[PDB]
Amino acid sequence: EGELKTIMGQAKVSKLQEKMKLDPRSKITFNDFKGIAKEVGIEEKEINSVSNALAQSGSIIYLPNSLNENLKTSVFTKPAHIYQSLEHILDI
Amino acid sequence: HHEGELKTIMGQAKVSKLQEKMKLDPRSKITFNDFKGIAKEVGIEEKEINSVSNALAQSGSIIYLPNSLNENLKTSVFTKPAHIYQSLEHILDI
């Protein structure tokens, strides 16, 4: 509702992005992503909404509906390389 | 979406390039119309801009407050909001 609450809620998701940049892993379980998010004050009640906003923003790749077991539970935290590689090998 | 992994990823790649453009742009505050222009430069249609701008705000990549009553905030996009987050926590100690 109010501007400050909005900005401060958003700041947590920015700190989430910061932590994922510094983590050396590029692929983590959703359970691990949940835990990093908790570290910056994002509760489990908000995690589905935050993951959907990060996926639509292009900031993570997360494919919970995939039939592949690997992809279904995995969060790609540095997707930029994946986007670039895909456009190159498929010549988009 | 079941079975749309490749379609999902490449649609996301457009918004990723939009965040790239905004990191490289030296401006830290632009109008929403300028933002729309930049998004269309990476191939994001007018029809998806409101959903893209919502996902970017919720992920903390922009500040965009269309419901504000301050006319300037209402039509402005903050493209490097990390400095604002940090400053706000600093000056209000929260």
CA dihedral in degrees (A54, B27, B48, B73; nearest 10)? 90
Instruction: Estimate to the nearest angstrom the gap between the alpha carbon of B69 and the chain centroid.
Output: 20
- CA A36, A39, A44, A46 torsion-angle sign: negative
Strand (E) or helix (H) holding B15: helix B5-24
Cβ atoms of A75 and A61 closer than 8 Å: yes
Cβ atoms of B31 and B37 closer than 8 Å: no
**Cα–Cα distance measured from residue B18 to residue B56, given in angstroms and rounded to the nearest whole number:** 10
DSSP code for B75: T
**Binary contact (B15, A57; C-beta < 8 A):** yes
**Binary contact (A13, B55; C-beta < 8 A):** no
Question: Phi/psi of residue B4, each to 5°?
Answer: -110, 30
B30 has which bridge partners?
Answer: B77
Distance from CA of A46 to the nearest CA of B (A): 11
Distance from CA of B24 to the nearest CA of A (A): 15
Give the resolution value in Å: 2.1
Q: Residue B17 corresponds to which tokens in the numbers above? A: 């390039």
Q: Which residues of A touch B56 (CB under 8 A)?
A: 53, 57
Instruction: Estimate to the nearest angstrom the gap between the alpha carbon of A48 and the chain centroid.
Output: 10
**Cα–Cα distance measured from residue A70 to residue B37, given in angstroms and rounded to the nearest whole number:** 37
Cβ atoms of A50 and B57 closer than 8 Å: no
Domain-by-domain residue ranges, chain B? 1-94
**Binary contact (B5, A55; C-beta < 8 A):** no
C-alpha radius of gyration, chain A, whole number: 14
Q: Which residues of A touch B89 (CB under 8 A)?
A: 11
**Cα–Cα distance measured from residue B50 to residue A52, given in angstroms and rounded to the nearest whole number:** 15
**Quick one: B53 exposed, middle or buried, by C-beta within 10 A (0-12, 13-18, 19+)?**
buried
Q: Residue B80 corresponds to which tokens in the numbers above? A: 């490097």
Distance from CA of B37 to the nearest CA of A (A): 17
B84: CB partners within 8 A, 6+ apart? A7, B63, B78
**Cα–Cα distance measured from residue B2 to residue A74, given in angstroms and rounded to the nearest whole number:** 15
**Binary contact (A57, B54; C-beta < 8 A):** no
Order of strands across the sheet with A74-76?
A27-29, A74-76, A61-62
3-state secondary structure (DSSP) of residue B51: helix
- List, as one string, the DSSP characters of A15-80: HHHHHHHHSS-SEEEHHHHHHHHHHTT--GGGHHHHHHHHHHTTS-EE-TT-SSHHHHTEEES-TH
